[PDB]
Ligand SMILES: NS(=O)(=O)c1c(F)c(F)c(NS(=O)(=O)c2c(F)c(F)c(F)c(F)c2F)c(F)c1F
Ligand SMILES: NS(=O)(=O)c1c(F)c(F)c(F)c(F)c1F
């Protein structure tokens with residue numbers, strides 16, 4: 001029953017998810033000058049060559065592209081991570097206008113949207129067990145700015161008309177998530193949480209410094225989705241982002257000097 005509106009949005013979540021006021025909540029503002037280079041970080045490895053996308057779903061909060069995670073087909077390793085993390089899904093957060101939409105901010109700057117590639121630590125066997133662990137998940141976050149079109153996003157944009165309302169799903173096989181990455185893998189990293197209820201504090205965040213460019217037309221199609229189900233009052237799926245939360249006793253590390 002949580003959402004993003006005035007009556008059930010981020011400022012209400014703590015009533016049912018008290019960890020919302022916890023010590024390692026996400027997202028955060030990334031102060032680029034306070035972030036510190038860490039020469040200890042190992043090289044980051046995004047290995048998506050054998051990814052198997054399955055389907056796309058409007059879950060009433062965002063849309064998720066789900067992957068076969070029954071083997072080590074698309075994995076994230078290295079950087080701050082110990083061991084292997086397997087891609088399970090990606091989704092976005094976006095705004096009603098280009099000046100807002102991201103969850104993380106960079107020196108308080110908000111981007112038009114933010115892509116999250118969600119991975120779970122294979123040492124825990126399944127996603128559900130992983131979210132009982134302080135190092136259960138790794139989320140690769142990528143900012144979107146509006147400018148030139150992103151060709152590798154277009155297949156996503158074009159299927160959205162078929163999942164307009166909550167509960168609708170569609171086939172989404174043979175999608176390559178490598179087409180959503182920027183050129184550089186420079187990143188910031190810190191320990192945090194899911195940014196949606198249940199807000200569990202299980203995530204190693206890896207936020208890429210380089211945004212991807214998408215066209216206005218691409219993001220406008222995100223904004224034609226509905227939060228509601230078919231046959232219910234229409235409410236546009238926009239502003240599905242949680243604002244920055246207190247950093248508390250954390251440090252953000254940079255992969256780049
Ligand atoms: N803590 S929370 O965000 O998860 C949450 C919440 F903050 C709530 F307020 C409810 N209350 S509600 O009854 O569902 C309800 C709404 F959520 C509405 F948005 C609304 F417009 C209503 F009229 C309404 F009745 C709720 F259940 C819930 F879990
Ligand atoms: N925003 S997020 O990347 O923190 C995130 C998750 F990591 C997750 F596993 C989910 F199930 C979500 F719904 C979600 F929004």
Ligand SMILES: OC[C@H]1O[C@@H](O)[C@H](O)[C@@H](O)[C@@H]1O
Pocket residue numbers: 036251
């Ligand atoms: O005590 C010194 C140490 O302080 C820590 O907070 C920093 O993360 C380290 O990089 C530093 O070496």
Ligand SMILES: [Zn+2]
Pocket residue numbers: 091092093116195
């Ligand atoms: Zn997310």
